[PDB]
Amino acid sequence: TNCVKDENIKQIVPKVMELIRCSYRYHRAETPEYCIMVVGVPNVGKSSLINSLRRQHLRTGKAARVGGEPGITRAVTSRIQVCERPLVFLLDTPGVLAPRIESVETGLKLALCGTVLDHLVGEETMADYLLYTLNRHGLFGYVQHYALASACDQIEWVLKNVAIKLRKTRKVKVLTGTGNVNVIQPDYAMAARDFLRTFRSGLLGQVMLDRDIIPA
Amino acid sequence: GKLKRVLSVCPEVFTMHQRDIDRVVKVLREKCLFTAQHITDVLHRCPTVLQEDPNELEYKFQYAYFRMGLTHLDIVRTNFLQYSITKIKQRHIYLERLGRYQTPDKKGQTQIPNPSLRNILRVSEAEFLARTACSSVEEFQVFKKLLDQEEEEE
Amino acid sequence: QFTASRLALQNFDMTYSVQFGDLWPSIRVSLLSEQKYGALVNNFAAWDSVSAKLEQLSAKDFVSEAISNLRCFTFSRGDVSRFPPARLGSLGLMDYYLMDAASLLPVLALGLQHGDTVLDLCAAPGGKTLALLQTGCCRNLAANDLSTSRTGRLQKVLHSYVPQDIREGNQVRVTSWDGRKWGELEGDTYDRVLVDVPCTTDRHSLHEEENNIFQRSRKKERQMLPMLQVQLLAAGLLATKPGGHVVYSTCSLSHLQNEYVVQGAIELLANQYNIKVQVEDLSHFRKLFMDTFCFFPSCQVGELVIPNLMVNFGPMYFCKLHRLP
RNA sequence: GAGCUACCUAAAAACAAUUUUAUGAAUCAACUCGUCUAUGUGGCAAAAUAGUGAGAAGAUUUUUAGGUAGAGGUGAAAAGCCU
RNA sequence: CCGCCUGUUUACCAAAAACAUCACCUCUAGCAUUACAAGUAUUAGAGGCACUGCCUGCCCAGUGAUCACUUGUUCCUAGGGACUAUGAACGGCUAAACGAGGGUCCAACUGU
RNA sequence: AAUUAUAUAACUUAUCUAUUUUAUAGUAUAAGUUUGAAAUUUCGGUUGGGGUGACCUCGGAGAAAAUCCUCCGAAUGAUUAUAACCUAGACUUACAAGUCAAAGUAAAAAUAUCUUUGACCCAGAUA
Numbered sequence A: 001t002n003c004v005k006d007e008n009i010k011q012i013v014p015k016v017m018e019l020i021r022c023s024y025r026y027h028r029a030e031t032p033e034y035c036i037m038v039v040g041v042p043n044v045g046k047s048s049l050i051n052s053l054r055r056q057h058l059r060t061g062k063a064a065r066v067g068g069e070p071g072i073t074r075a076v077t078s079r080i081q082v083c084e085r086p087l088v089f090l091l092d093t094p095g096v097l098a099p100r101i102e103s104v105e106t107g108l109k110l111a112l113c114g115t116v117l118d119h120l121v122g123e124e125t126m127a128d129y130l131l132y133t134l135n136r137h138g139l140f141g142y143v144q145h146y147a148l149a150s151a152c153d154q155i156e157w158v159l160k161n162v163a164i165k166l167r168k169t170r171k172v173k174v175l176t177g178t179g180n181v182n183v184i185q186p187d188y189a190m191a192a193r194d195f196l197r198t199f200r201s202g203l204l205g206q207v208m209l210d211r212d213i214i215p216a
Numbered sequence B: 001g002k003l004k005r006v007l008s009v010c011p012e013v014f015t016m017h018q019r020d021i022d023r024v025v026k027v028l029r030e031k032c033l034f035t036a037q038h039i040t041d042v043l044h045r046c047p048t049v050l051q052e053d054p055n056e057l058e059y060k061f062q063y064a065y066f067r068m069g070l071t072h073l074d075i076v077r078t079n080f081l082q083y084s085i086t087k088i089k090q091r092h093i094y095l096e097r098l099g100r101y102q103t104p105d106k107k108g109q110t111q112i113p114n115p116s117l118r119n120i121l122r123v124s125e126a127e128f129l130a131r132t133a134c135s136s137v138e139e140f141q142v143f144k145k146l147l148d149q150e151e152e153e154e
Numbered sequence C: 001q002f003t004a005s006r007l008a009l010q011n012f013d014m015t016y017s018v019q020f021g022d023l024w025p026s027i028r029v030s031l032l033s034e035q036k037y038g039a040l041v042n043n044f045a046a047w048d049s050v051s052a053k054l055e056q057l058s059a060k061d062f063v064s065e066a067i068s069n070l071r072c073f074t075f076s077r078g079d080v081s082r083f084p085p086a087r088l089g090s091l092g093l094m095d096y097y098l099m100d101a102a103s104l105l106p107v108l109a110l111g112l113q114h115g116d117t118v119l120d121l122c123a124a125p126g127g128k129t130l131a132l133l134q135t136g137c138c139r140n141l142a143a144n145d146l147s148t149s150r151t152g153r154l155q156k157v158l159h160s161y162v163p164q165d166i167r168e169g170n171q172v173r174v175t176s177w178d179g180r181k182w183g184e185l186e187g188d189t190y191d192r193v194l195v196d197v198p199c200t201t202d203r204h205s206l207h208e209e210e211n212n213i214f215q216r217s218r219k220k221e222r223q224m225l226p227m228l229q230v231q232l233l234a235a236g237l238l239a240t241k242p243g244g245h246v247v248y249s250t251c252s253l254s255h256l257q258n259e260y261v262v263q264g265a266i267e268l269l270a271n272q273y274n275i276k277v278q279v280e281d282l283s284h285f286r287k288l289f290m291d292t293f294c295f296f297p298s299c300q301v302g303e304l305v306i307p308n309l310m311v312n313f314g315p316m317y318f319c320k321l322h323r324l325p
Numbered sequence D: 001g002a003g004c005u006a007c008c009u010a011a012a013a014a015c016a017a018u019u020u021u022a023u024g025a026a027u028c029a030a031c032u033c034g035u036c037u038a039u040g041u042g043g044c045a046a047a048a049u050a051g052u053g054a055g056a057a058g059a060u061u062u063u064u065a066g067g068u069a070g071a072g073g074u075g076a077a078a079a080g081c082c083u
Numbered sequence E: 001c002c003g004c005c006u007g008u009u010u011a012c013c014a015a016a017a018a019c020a021u022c023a024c025c026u027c028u029a030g031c032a033u034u035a036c037a038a039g040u041a042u043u044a045g046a047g048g049c050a051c052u053g054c055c056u057g058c059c060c061a062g063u064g065a066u067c068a069c070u071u072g073u074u075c076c077u078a079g080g081g082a083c084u085a086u087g088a089a090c091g092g093c094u095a096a097a098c099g100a101g102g103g104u105c106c107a108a109c110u111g112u
Numbered sequence F: 001a002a003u004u005a006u007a008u009a010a011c012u013u014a015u016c017u018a019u020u021u022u023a024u025a026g027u028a029u030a031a032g033u034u035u036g037a038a039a040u041u042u043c044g045g046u047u048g049g050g051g052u053g054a055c056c057u058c059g060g061a062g063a064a065a066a067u068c069c070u071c072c073g074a075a076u077g078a079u080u081a082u083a084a085c086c087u088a089g090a091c092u093u094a095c096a097a098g099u100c101a102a103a104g105u106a107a108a109a110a111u112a113u114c115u116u117u118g119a120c121c122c123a124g125a126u127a
């Protein structure tokens, strides 16, 4: 499903109703009102799905606050009307990620997707993994958005160029033999934040992370 | 042109006493809450409304507004007031009891798509039964007699 | 806040629509429309008199036409004409009983034989008892009802119609005791027994708001109906003598309350009490009375009466059970 | 009872310097307001002080006189204001 | 994330995401000597609502084609006449700018 | 919500004018009808917090003279041999209401047989 462009969001309701048919309902067997729950890791579009269905069937609009940051929906809220003819109701729940993330790579792959707030994983480390994956997949689309000539495999080098392209500078305390001196420096951190953003928007190419480790 | 059609269908528009015209118009304004433009549309589109007595036009409008869940625009654009009450009740009630029609609820929603008002009334009885309700002509005649008895008891 | 009638219609649409498919609308409108009454003469005082006057009214006895001792007058197909209210005869007995014609079909299918003993496990005001006691020629008929207020109605009807002499003798015996308990009281006693279990009363449930089974407070009882119905049918199955016949009657259209209850009673009786009940074919019944009735034949066990606007004589379900041993 | 406050009518007044696509633009005084913190809590004060902040040629601010009165008035609706 | 923006508000616990706001939309009114207004539909009043551009498309008798029959509506009695003559509801976002708004991050800075 | 409602706005009949061959128009008022600007008054009781359902009077039955204790019914009809008046003494009972009844007299020539509830005021129907 794509929720910004409302693609394939019609097929969900017929399938969802079909599954309920085959199953049992017991306590709620007599109720004509269908309620269902959306859950997942944060920043996957759970709240978007609610609004997108709401406008494709009920044609009213946005009912759940939608944001570009993980962790916007805080608690399980009240019911929100989503459809009319089937009359399905959707319950919205806060994103829940995991107690343990299995492999650290599993945690990098989620950090790149925006599931993890980049500040408790490190912007620089996430940037290196992004470059590592982007080069292996052959999608050298970050050398045209940002002029990088032959391209590279060192995160420090590529981050240097993009910082120059964006004319960003910091005053950073560097620690030398004779003491501490504040030196104007290219903004590596700001470059990493912007470099990840273009990847998230999609202008750096179409990527399937699980292609390599779990092709199956 | 609007006068021409009105004069042909309702020749007595000029002859009718002032009271009769004012009552019909006032019913449309105070009681039916039609806009100024719609009043002209209804009078021009269905001139016979002037002949129809007051307190009977109001009942028909409220029947559409409340029981059938229609809006002012739908009533005007379909010439609902043109038809007779008997035809409206016979066809609507048959569809409702059949379950093929359903009042818009408080939210304004209907569980099943309601048939188009043009299909309910404008079309012929044979097409209306065959297509909108998918029933038999004999049942409709029996229903009409059964409905008639209830009105007497009512 | 949906009313009890609203809930009944709401529930029926959810379930009956699936069960009956394309036929649900026709049934839906018929149930909501006014019912059709079939006049049943009292025989006795006016065995001929009432028949002549009703014939002048153009009503025709369908039972007599079907045979072509119960004679019930009904109007022609699609005729909406009503019946004049029943009047007291010169001899002091009522001319006729106006009741649902389909309600009399289970009695006609019970195959009463002369010199028999009959029981109505739950005949509250039912004319089924009146039809049974009328020309049945069944010795020592018994009536039992869970309630006492409705038991009063039964005596009223008997008093108005049945002459004192027939009723005065113990040949008619009225009781107010639990139907399920009755099975233990009189096992293998009666040749023919009619069990009309409490049912969802679909037509009355929609029309009547008061004492509606679909009320929120009575939800507990409404859910428990299938269990209670099975118990009553089993008790009657115990009571009937070896080789006896019993008919299970239900007003509702629910598959749960019609097919599962009868088969459940058979299975429970087959296991706990080690008795085998073999059903008797009723297909020929559909052919006989198709003129004045319309039946949904698919039902594996029993015959169901579907109300249609042409013939609004539904709703009734009745299955004939013969005790092989 | 509108010498406070709300809105209005009449007659008046004030706005330096610096930049600007020339303005309900920018920087920032006078002036208007009152963001955040500490103090004060019978206090200097029945709402202040000290810092820190917002606007500052405009839907700006301010002065004088008049007007609308409680079943009411006024209100860029806080059911806010009318000693 | 929220609100288009500059503005406004609970004097004395809330300055805000609330109110107003240009723009857009709906409804009412064909008129003069005290308001509206010494005005007149490009006006005035009442009220709603971010604009911008982009989508969805309620809907407007049928069938043979300006044209014939069936409908529809009325009457006279099931027969006989008379008469028809773009756009609702919605949305996703100009997309920027701006903010003593509410969250978050980095750098620096420090007696936190 | 109940009671009102010459605030407006319509109408109808009078009244008053004109005209008119009975018609029109109008209208310092009265009586109606329709709208409702407003006005006045109220928020029964039992129900963990609610939501909900319910319940509030009387009769029958168990516990056995307690209970939010457990059941059935009634706001009855049927049945008729039609069942008067008058009057000791008692029951029950806060009050109110509700029961039984000898004697005497009078109709006839066995009682009604099954087994319940609503006061006062105020309105009705009659001879």
Ligand SMILES: Nc1nc2c(ncn2[C@@H]2O[C@H](COP(=O)(O)OP(=O)(O)NP(=O)(O)O)[C@@H](O)[C@H]2O)c(=O)[nH]1
Pocket: A001, A002, A003, A004, A005, A040, A041, A042, A043, A044, A045, A046, A047, A048, A049, A065, A066, A067, A068, A069, A070, A071, A072, A073, A074, A093, A094, A095
């Ligand atoms: N490209 C793209 N972006 C999408 C899609 N669906 C959602 N998004 C983006 O994801 C964000 C919205 O996610 P949201 O619906 O809040 O997800 P959530 O899981 O419900 N939020 P939370 O983390 O608080 O639990 C926005 O940045 C939105 O543009 C999609 O189909 N495509």
Ligand SMILES: [Mg+2]
Pocket: none
């Ligand atoms: Mg002043």
Ligand SMILES: [Mg+2]
Pocket: D015
């Ligand atoms: Mg200056």
Ligand SMILES: [Mg+2]
Pocket: none
């Ligand atoms: Mg400025």
Ligand SMILES: [Mg+2]
Pocket: none
């Ligand atoms: Mg400033």
Ligand SMILES: [Mg+2]
Pocket: none
């Ligand atoms: Mg500024």
Ligand SMILES: [Mg+2]
Pocket: none
């Ligand atoms: Mg102000």
Ligand SMILES: [Mg+2]
Pocket: D077
């Ligand atoms: Mg407010």
Ligand SMILES: [Mg+2]
Pocket: none
């Ligand atoms: Mg408030």
Ligand SMILES: [Mg+2]
Pocket: E003
């Ligand atoms: Mg703002």
Ligand SMILES: [Mg+2]
Pocket: none
């Ligand atoms: Mg501002």
Ligand SMILES: [Mg+2]
Pocket: none
């Ligand atoms: Mg202020």
Ligand SMILES: [Mg+2]
Pocket: E010
């Ligand atoms: Mg304050």
Ligand SMILES: [Mg+2]
Pocket: E015, E100
């Ligand atoms: Mg502020």
Ligand SMILES: [Mg+2]
Pocket: none
């Ligand atoms: Mg403050």
Ligand SMILES: [Mg+2]
Pocket: E018
């Ligand atoms: Mg606002």
